[PDB]
């Protein structure tokens, strides 16, 4: 499938920047800007811009875009707006999007429709807790939505020393061709890589070898847009990942590291389909999913928001993901008896230690290194440096 | 191809005897209405109450996906308590009991978490309190039981309306016998006024212009659980019969039947269920207007659902491949024309919305609605209904 970038072609860029100057403008924040990037680069192919009411309904009710062939798209990609914004811009055939004083895109032939936040949130997240970090933001947004045809002007760069890893779906496909990959397997992550993740990646690599693939390539694809405030920063995670690769826990010769530009929504089984379909767009043939993907603890009752087995189950059954195979895994934990990461077994409960991100910080605070084989020692060292800086 | 879950009539004695030998689970009236839905084949190709994978599929995608795509947008599930689960977990089969009577065998059971709050948020698109169906869900247990269902004796309600309770198979057989060349279906839960009739008449005429010679109307009122302030089924049936009596709808080209499903008031999610059920009964066209399956927010009074969403979602919904959706704009009483007409804003002051409360008010006042809003005899049935309220 062809990736539909929404960037104005190089030759036509100046003429478009000229037109953008004369139009009215809407100011957008960093998160909207990240959604603009997701759209420009083609991650939400075949959308031509921010969702009109028709696509919005399709993704909310069916988790698929239906016009052009069934293709999975389970999250709204929408632009919000106040009644003030609406009354100002309603009745014009185009306006410019503005971020940090710069006119970043043109939205053409806009349509205004009701946000209906309660329904959107209930269907997207399975809850309307306004203490959910992303939902909190949605609830602070306007009651109107704007759809339309999006024309993105200047290519998006963040100028933070990580732009070299922000490869488009097209750049990623070119990369895999250059490497002579005969199978690409993808691992989405928002956390530091431990050897449970590596176990999933290594076992997927072995499964691909056993099927007859000779040059399977890992796409290690950390998420790089908005995350909740207690998540490990992207720069610190990038450093931690490099340490894992340097230690050879993952092989740097058969691995591609890129940053996935999407905001994190913590919407569990609905979001896992979004993470999946975006890797499909980038040329992934296999997608790894473990326990409780895209999940978080309910804010209040510290219980899992989503049932931990559901992400894999739902993704396994999901339509509009035909060209990519799901590789599901059960929980991996540290096996004390074998002194390595292993798949959890209830018949041997007390063999296993579970170490969460909260447990990791506390361990560091207490001058501890995690057990041998839980994490590459060098990568742990990077983590201890992150925890120390939190002071 | 309907998959009835009733046991064949010559296998029935064996099945009732087998059912006697089993542990039992008592079910309520609404549960019983869902057993009837399943038994009659309205949820084809379901084998019984949903297992976890089907439940996940319909919550997340509005479709069954195993070896084909068929629309199914509502959980058809059997709830259980922790005590019920404790007792029945490990049974290869058990009976369902309603009013001391064994009505069904559930075989090869599987228990999975209900996750009520998540279920409700995805199904109703709301976490609002005081929804009438959601309120019954919240009172139920945290476990669900799926499995293969064999229903026993034909379900009768013995209320004087069982002759309207046709299975999809009987409806198809009926259409054949009337030489129908097209069946258009109309779902309803309210009294029929002449705006409803306008939708039906214009579908009839559009079907004639399209080439069909014997189009049949399936007037198909919903007959299972409904909220407290809705008009009782027996009264709605008398009111519809008056409408046909007056020939606002032609009794010769119309089949009246009662759809057994509980009413969930879930808007766009529920309209798909209403639509797919008529597809099973051989409907080729399905009429939908504004706010189908909708209701006001108990608190704010604002529409729970955006009124145009039902028709929009339905027209683009998957798994309804042999049925044509016939979407309509708002019909309302036109004063300048003295008749029911399609709502238009340039002439907005010519229109009046005549609701259930406008009608109850005119009833306690000896006033009729304007001429052309309803058939005179049908209005009379309603005045008798309102009389009986106090
Ligand atoms: N005034 C109207 N204009 C257009 N369609 C209408 C109007 N009133 C009701 N309808 C509709 O008639 C059908 C049955 O409506 P109701 O019996 O009120 O409630 S429903 O729950 O079954 O949808 C629906 O398709 C529908 O939206
Ligand atoms: N201990 C584990 N066992 C099995 N799978 C795991 C484990 N920890 C994380 N996963 C998973 O690893 C992948 C990335 O997890 P995270 O980065 O923590 O969160 S996620 O938001 O990207 O899903 C997911 O597929 C996933 O469910
Ligand atoms: K607003
Ligand atoms: K319980």
Short mmCIF file of N, CA and C and ligand atoms in Angstrom, two decimals, chain A residues 187-192 194 196-197 200 223 264 266 271-272 275 287-295 329-333 341 343 354, ligand 2:
data_model
loop_
_atom_site.label_atom_id
_atom_site.label_comp_id
_atom_site.label_asym_id
_atom_site.label_seq_id
_atom_site.Cartn_x
_atom_site.Cartn_y
_atom_site.Cartn_z
N UNK A 187 8.19 -3.86 17.73
CA UNK A 187 7.95 -3.76 19.17
C UNK A 187 7.71 -2.28 19.54
N UNK A 188 6.46 -1.97 19.84
CA UNK A 188 6.02 -0.72 20.44
C UNK A 188 6.32 -0.73 21.93
N UNK A 189 6.85 0.38 22.43
CA UNK A 189 7.13 0.54 23.85
C UNK A 189 7.09 2.01 24.27
N UNK A 190 6.72 2.27 25.53
CA UNK A 190 6.76 3.61 26.10
C UNK A 190 7.65 3.64 27.36
N UNK A 191 8.23 2.49 27.68
CA UNK A 191 9.01 2.30 28.92
C UNK A 191 10.44 1.90 28.63
N UNK A 192 11.34 1.97 29.64
CA UNK A 192 12.67 1.39 29.47
C UNK A 192 12.59 -0.11 29.16
N UNK A 194 13.51 -3.75 29.51
CA UNK A 194 14.13 -4.75 30.35
C UNK A 194 14.22 -6.09 29.61
N UNK A 196 12.55 -8.76 29.90
CA UNK A 196 11.25 -9.37 29.63
C UNK A 196 10.84 -8.94 28.22
N UNK A 197 10.98 -7.65 27.93
CA UNK A 197 10.76 -7.15 26.58
C UNK A 197 11.68 -7.85 25.61
N UNK A 200 10.56 -11.27 24.64
CA UNK A 200 9.49 -11.20 23.64
C UNK A 200 10.09 -10.99 22.26
N UNK A 223 7.66 5.07 21.61
CA UNK A 223 6.72 6.15 21.39
C UNK A 223 7.35 7.46 21.88
N UNK A 264 0.62 9.47 23.42
CA UNK A 264 0.14 8.27 24.11
C UNK A 264 -1.20 8.61 24.77
N UNK A 266 -3.18 6.09 26.53
CA UNK A 266 -3.45 5.09 27.58
C UNK A 266 -4.87 4.58 27.51
N UNK A 271 -6.22 1.53 21.89
CA UNK A 271 -4.99 2.17 21.48
C UNK A 271 -4.01 1.18 20.84
N UNK A 272 -3.99 -0.06 21.33
CA UNK A 272 -3.11 -1.07 20.78
C UNK A 272 -3.35 -1.28 19.28
N UNK A 275 -1.53 1.67 17.59
CA UNK A 275 -0.09 1.36 17.58
C UNK A 275 0.25 0.33 16.52
N UNK A 287 3.73 -7.93 14.47
CA UNK A 287 3.59 -7.00 15.58
C UNK A 287 3.49 -7.76 16.88
N UNK A 288 4.42 -7.48 17.78
CA UNK A 288 4.44 -8.10 19.08
C UNK A 288 3.55 -7.38 20.10
N UNK A 289 2.78 -8.15 20.85
CA UNK A 289 1.92 -7.59 21.88
C UNK A 289 2.00 -8.51 23.09
N UNK A 290 2.19 -7.95 24.28
CA UNK A 290 2.20 -8.72 25.51
C UNK A 290 0.98 -8.47 26.38
N UNK A 291 1.20 -8.45 27.70
CA UNK A 291 0.13 -8.27 28.65
C UNK A 291 -0.17 -6.76 28.85
N UNK A 292 -1.44 -6.44 29.08
CA UNK A 292 -1.88 -5.07 29.39
C UNK A 292 -1.22 -3.96 28.52
N UNK A 293 -1.21 -4.13 27.18
CA UNK A 293 -0.56 -3.11 26.39
C UNK A 293 -1.38 -1.81 26.39
N UNK A 294 -0.67 -0.68 26.34
CA UNK A 294 -1.26 0.67 26.37
C UNK A 294 -2.13 0.90 27.60
N UNK A 295 -1.91 0.11 28.64
CA UNK A 295 -2.73 0.25 29.83
C UNK A 295 -2.07 1.13 30.86
N UNK A 329 1.90 -12.49 23.46
CA UNK A 329 2.63 -13.16 24.53
C UNK A 329 1.92 -13.01 25.85
N UNK A 330 2.08 -14.00 26.72
CA UNK A 330 1.64 -13.90 28.11
C UNK A 330 2.73 -13.19 28.92
N UNK A 331 2.44 -12.88 30.18
CA UNK A 331 3.36 -12.09 31.00
C UNK A 331 4.71 -12.80 31.17
N UNK A 332 5.78 -12.04 31.00
CA UNK A 332 7.12 -12.49 31.31
C UNK A 332 7.49 -11.87 32.65
N UNK A 333 8.16 -12.64 33.50
CA UNK A 333 8.66 -12.14 34.78
C UNK A 333 10.00 -12.81 35.13
N UNK A 341 14.84 -14.01 32.84
CA UNK A 341 13.46 -13.68 32.52
C UNK A 341 12.83 -14.90 31.88
N UNK A 343 8.58 -16.85 31.04
CA UNK A 343 7.11 -16.72 31.04
C UNK A 343 6.49 -17.21 32.33
N UNK A 354 8.11 -10.12 40.19
CA UNK A 354 7.61 -9.11 39.29
C UNK A 354 8.20 -7.78 39.71
N1 LIG C 2 6.23 -8.20 31.71
C1 LIG C 2 5.66 -8.27 30.48
N2 LIG C 2 5.25 -9.45 29.95
C2 LIG C 2 4.68 -9.54 28.73
N3 LIG C 2 4.49 -8.44 27.96
C3 LIG C 2 4.92 -7.19 28.51
C4 LIG C 2 5.49 -7.10 29.76
N4 LIG C 2 5.77 -5.80 30.00
C5 LIG C 2 5.40 -5.09 28.91
N5 LIG C 2 4.87 -5.95 28.02
C6 LIG C 2 4.52 -5.40 26.83
O1 LIG C 2 5.63 -4.82 26.10
C7 LIG C 2 5.08 -3.98 25.09
C8 LIG C 2 5.40 -2.55 25.51
O2 LIG C 2 5.05 -2.32 26.88
P1 LIG C 2 5.23 -0.87 27.59
O3 LIG C 2 6.27 -0.05 26.89
O4 LIG C 2 5.37 -1.10 29.07
O5 LIG C 2 3.79 -0.22 27.46
S1 LIG C 2 2.99 0.07 26.07
O6 LIG C 2 2.10 1.18 26.41
O7 LIG C 2 3.88 0.44 24.97
O8 LIG C 2 2.17 -1.08 25.68
C9 LIG C 2 3.58 -4.34 25.00
O9 LIG C 2 3.31 -5.19 23.91
C10 LIG C 2 3.35 -5.10 26.25
O10 LIG C 2 2.12 -5.47 26.59
#
